[PDB]
């Protein structure tokens, strides 16, 4: 007999009831192949969460272009947009691709993301990268900060929890990247600073987590995806995305953490 997915799903529906919006979740146990899935194929805005995949695309490019990560990007004052706390410190010198990648992932730096997008051929180049690993759902169409509009019914700048989880697994645990690049992606995710109240809040403190968050600031739209390494166990990959119908519907980090907890608890 197969899983009773109605029973797996029920607590997400109650959670999203109180939240006033939609919650989408996919979780993969790479030990058993067990999954938990709730609106897992619906589209949600990526917001800043595309930046993890951007860092992976940079790493892929570095496989073809020796020393790419070492390359300085010396930018002007018009690179600087709000929520760029690292790239704003280094206007007088520039930053390396590696530093920009770390800042995009770990501080969600907007200008760093835009600079790296430019290096990879814009939103379309990142999307092409995702298509190269078999992700047909992911799309990045716009730049920072327009990509955060999160307009209900707009497919631009969205993915699904399932596609995000599958692509994250391929890139962090699978061999989609060479081993050095894969470990670098994992290390960047593990050093994220913005995720303490989201998936990480649902995970025992002695288990390593890498994650990337997103918060569009409108339409109750926010998210997190992660790899979790339980001690002496196969890792778990999961994604939690939210959205809501009114522009002034609040996002909730507590709802993300609660959903993560329901997904992690429900595996296998």
Ligand X SMILES: *C(=O)N1C[C@H](NOS(=O)(=O)O)CC[C@H]1C(=O)NNC(=O)[C@@H]1CCCNC1
Annotated binding site for a beta-lactam: 48, 51, 83, 108, 110, 213, 215
Partnered with residue 240 across adjacent β-strands are 25, 224
Backbone φ and ψ of 73, nearest 5°: -115, 115
Report the residue from 55, 203, 216, 258 that binds ligand X according to the rule CB under 6 A.
216
- DSSP symbols for 188-254: HHHT-SS-TTTGGGGS-TTSEEEEEEEE-SSTT-EEEEEEEE-TTS--EEEEEEEE-SSTTPPP-HH
Of 130 and 176, the one with the shorter C-beta distance to ligand X is: 130
Cα 47 to Cα 53: distance, rounded to the nearest angstrom:
12
Active site residue 146: yes
Q: What number of chain residues touch ligand X (CB under 6 A)?
A: 14
Asked whether position 217 contacts ligand X by CB under 6 A, the answer is yes
Q: Which range, of 89-97, 163-171, 215-223, 230-238, touches ligand X by CB under 6 A?
A: 215-223
Report the residue from 145, 151, 173, 201 that binds ligand X according to the rule CB under 6 A.
145
* Least distance (Å) between residue 29 CB and ligand X: 26
Which runs of consecutive H residues, i.e. helices, occur in 47-95?
A: 50-64
Residue nearest to ligand X (CB): 48
- From the candidates 16, 22, 37, 48, give the one annotated as an active-site residue: 48
Encode burial over 32-51: b for 16+ CB neighbours within 10 A, e otherwise: eeebbbbbbeebbbbbbbbb
Active site residue 265: no
| DSSP state for residue 73 in the 8-state scheme | E
What DSSP element (H or E) covers 174?
Answer: none
Asked whether position 218 contacts ligand X by CB under 6 A, the answer is yes
Pattern of binders to ligand X over 30-49, x per CB under 6 A?
A: -----------------xx-
Tell me which residues touch ligand X (CB under 6 A). 47-48, 83, 108, 110, 145, 148, 194, 213-218
């Amino acid at each position: 007999a197969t899983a009773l997915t109605n029973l797996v799903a029920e607590p997400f529906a109650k959670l999203e009831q109180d939240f006033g919006g939609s919650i989408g979740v996919y979780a993969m146990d790479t030990g058993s192949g067990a999954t938990v899935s709730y609106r897992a194929e619906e589209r949600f805005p990526l917001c800043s969460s595309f930046k993890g995949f951007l860092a992976a695309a940079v790493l892929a490019r570095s496989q073809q272009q020796a020393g790419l990560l070492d390359t300085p990007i010396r930018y002007g004052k018009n690179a600087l947009v709000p929520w760029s706390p690292i790239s704003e410190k280094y206007l007088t010198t520039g930053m390396t691709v590696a530093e920009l990648s770390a800042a995009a992932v770990q501080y969600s730096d907007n200008a760093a993301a835009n600079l790296l997008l430019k290096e990879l051929g814009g939103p379309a180049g990142l999307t092409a990268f995702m298509r190269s690993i078999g992700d047909t759902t992911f799309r990045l169409d716009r730049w920072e900060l327009e990509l955060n509009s999160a307009i209900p019914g707009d497919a631009r700048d969205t993915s699904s929890p399932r596609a995000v989880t599958e692509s994250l697994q391929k890139l962090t645990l699978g061999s989609a990247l060479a081993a050095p690049q894969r470990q670098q992606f994992v290390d960047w995710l593990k050093g994220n600073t913005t995720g303490n109240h989201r998936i990480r809040a649902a995970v025992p403190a002695d288990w390593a987590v890498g994650d990337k968050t997103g918060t569009c600031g409108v339409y109750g739209t926010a998210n997190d995806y992660a790899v979790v390494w339980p001690t002496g166990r196969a890792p778990i990959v999961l994604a939690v995305y939210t959205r809501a119908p009114n522009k002034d519907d609040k996002h909730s980090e507590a709802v993300i953490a609660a959903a993560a907890r329901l997904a992690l608890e429900g595996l296998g």
